[PDB]
Design a protein around this ligand. Sequence first.
Ligand SMILES: [Ca+2]
Ligand SMILES: [Ca+2]
Lengths: 485, 153, 421
Amino acid sequence: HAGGLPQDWRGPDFCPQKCPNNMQYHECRSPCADTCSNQEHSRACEDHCVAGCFCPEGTVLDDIGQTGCVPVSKCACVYNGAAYAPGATYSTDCTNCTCSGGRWSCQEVPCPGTCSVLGGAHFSTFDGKQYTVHGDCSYVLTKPCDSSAFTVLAELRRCGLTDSETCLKSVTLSLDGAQTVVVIKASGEVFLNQIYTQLPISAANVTIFRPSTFFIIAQTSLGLQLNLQLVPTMQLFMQLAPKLRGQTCGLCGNFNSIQADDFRTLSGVVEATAAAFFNTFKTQAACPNIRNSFEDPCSLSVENEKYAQHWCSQLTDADGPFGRCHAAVKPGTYYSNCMFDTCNCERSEDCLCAALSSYVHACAAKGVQLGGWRDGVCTKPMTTCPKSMTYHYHVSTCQPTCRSLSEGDITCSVGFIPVDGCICPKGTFLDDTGKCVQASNCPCYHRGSMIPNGESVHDSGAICTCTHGKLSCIGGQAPAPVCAA
Amino acid sequence: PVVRASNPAHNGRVCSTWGSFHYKTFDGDVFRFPGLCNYVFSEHCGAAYEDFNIQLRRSQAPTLSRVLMKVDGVVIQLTKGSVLVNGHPVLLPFSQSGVLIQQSSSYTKVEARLGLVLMWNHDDSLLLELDTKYANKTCGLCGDFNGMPVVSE
Amino acid sequence: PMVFFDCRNATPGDTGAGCQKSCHTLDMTCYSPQCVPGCVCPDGLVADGEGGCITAEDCPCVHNEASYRAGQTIRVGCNTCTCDSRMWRCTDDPCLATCAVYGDGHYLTFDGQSYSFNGDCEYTLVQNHCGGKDSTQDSFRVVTENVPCGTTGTTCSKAIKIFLGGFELKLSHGKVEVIGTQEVPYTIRQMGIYLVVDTDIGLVLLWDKKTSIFINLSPEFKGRVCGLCGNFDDIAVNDFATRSRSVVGDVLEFGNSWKLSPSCPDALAPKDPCTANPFRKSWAQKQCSILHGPTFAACHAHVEPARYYEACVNDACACDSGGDCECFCTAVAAYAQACHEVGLCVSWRTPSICPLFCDYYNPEGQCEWHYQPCGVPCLRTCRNPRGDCLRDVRGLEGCYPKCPPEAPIFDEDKMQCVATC
Ligand SMILES: [Ca+2]
Ligand SMILES: [Ca+2]
């Protein structure tokens, strides 16, 4: 206490002191003992030296395993409450880390970005920035700044008596300087180049399909993917390849891993409010300028607030249907969206179901399945699909069809974030009339033309009849036509 | 108020008891008092509101049987193998209301963010270190903490 | 000159008003596929928002719900932006970043990551020499000391310790202690309600003397710092890097990894204050509504008050152990300082709402001290006889002296207006 440095005077027989593990008793050492977690605590110490048990020089205390004093090279690492081992590795979607000397060494890996428009008003950019503006126009979501290779537009329109009830009515995907325009409406209709088409479409540089009755997925060759949820309300999830980092710009940010500049307008400065930056991406002059107020819809109605609190708190309930996802996706933002949407919109159940489905889709994107989450609420969509369709919580594949059976190739993107909805049951193929039929009822196809059962076709002198969904050919087959020189 | 400090010798802020009833006051007066009753080790009697009040009791070898601390409404009772906080046994380390109680291989330490540190070692020594803001405002076996050994004690 | 165009006689390939732009629509690409009725300016003209039509290059620049003509000047951070043909021309001078810690563990890092952490121990707010531990410069370490403030599990700061070189500063209660061990590389200056510690390495600290700290770090320390204030590399997601040098998603783990003493118990998730203390909630919502009313209406376009309002309500709900007014005043003063930093001199302290006793500093038979919302950046004093102001600190509100012409130099040590020092 006087600022001195006493020297050890004890011994095995002269006032012996015992220490746990391999620690040694010293009269003057720093009380800030280095451990595996904090291996430089002694250097960052403000107290004077004290007497007690200390680790031998060259070793630090093992607080993770309580195995006495261990060398720095033998120190373990802790991640998510689970102790690792020297040399053990873990990986996230964006990084890969390895334990060494009690510290994590991390290497970056290629990582696609995700923008989200949920509830018609809640935006989450590629860099993770979140905001909420209730627009009344068509807005530029994502677009390269220096080119027009692709462009995504969202038609956010006021769909209620008040100015804070916004619906996403359509999504426009423009390709190659507006040479390929696909407009997907909230009613499920798809317009390719102003022509009402039928899914799936394999157009120039884009393929659009319907994995289920609830979702429409559009994948482009430029690294862009769109998931569009149509039941109960239209919500958008855009995924962008890492090759476009720092190049896009719109309502979804510039994809440069920085949240600060995500509110930067085309003028060149970063705005302070979400509404000011949001209003600069209008497409028409007549659209109103949205000013963000500080309303709290849940405070305007007792019953609405009670309903929203009762049914939206399941998102943050650790022991509920969504409890297996709190480690993957933080539910706070989804809980706030659920509360606001349920209290604000007239159809409270629809907005509650939309928020729950958005959280479930985020969890599925992270790789967590929450099947059986519709028990108690949102039961109605499970009992509304056509006669031959049945519901499924997990739809990670593509719908099999009679044309898929005949041709052998199904128009799909193969790999997409798993979705939910009503599909054809297993072993049953979707017929061209929107009906799920068995393999024995799927029609034959020759040269892209439907061949009804009992009919025959003539090809290279061979007669092939369509029986029981199979195109048998008399004479065995027609192996290979040969043309003489 | 800017207060400078350069001297690291701070023996004037430390009062302790050890061995055969040996006491050292904050002012450096070392004496012996073989009392086995309950005595006030140190308390903040210089203000209308008392920040701390530490009492110690001895039992017969001059062993320490009980240490009672009143720290800003927190009552800590330290006995051999037992730590009670507000009448409830606790598991160390224990942090509550700015008071941290932790046991080591050689001592039990109670640190109070108002500026006090108490050490009950395993050689039966009770050492108290006080912040300099409590100078000239204490009383008990540890003196009045004014830098002068005999006067006022 | 705008004419109403209707789609009654809509020839193919004619958008009408669907591709009519304005001074606010910064994207000039025509996206409408079909005709939309509405007002259309003459060919090659865009709307100016007041009914007229002007050329695209003549549209005024838009910034924070305001319009600026060509050649006008705005200030962002430290740079200057000039409007020119709808664009902003800004210099590229790097400057400081501010980490703000206030209230019941409300943190905002250098890179803009906002979070809430309630840790009971001492935590490394910022320090250099994290990776490699050599780098350059001299090692510095700003460490916060915390104490429970409430009964719901919230925790607020009590003392701030700055370890620079071989010197230590302890800002505690309302005083500063130079624990010490060359010359002192510190400059302590009381301006407004703030105590400013300036270092020669490029580190500034504003302390409201109760619970609020604002650490300003020069751009020379980018990527060379760590702690609860992030690592200062313009990325906010990776600011949750534990002491083991791994970015985690749990705020509790990241906060607990930065405690000074490994033996200190780890913090747990606190209860919801307005849920654990409902009987206070209304009062909170009635008191923090100042952040949404006409008092700060001019600032709503420049600083978003959502997180400040949330922190105010949570602190007022959790300030249940004594001192609700201090919690409320700190929460509102955080937003007030945020407004002042961007050049908005908003006055919010009334005799009923966080009063300041300026007249307490008036000597016998004198009246000089007055409340300043943005403060006096360059006020004449003994250490600044020429009346210079270095910027780098903006809007430090509080009581400032207005020395008369007879005695125009303010001596802080004597705390009086004198003719010469
Ligand atoms: Ca970015
Ligand atoms: Ca960072």
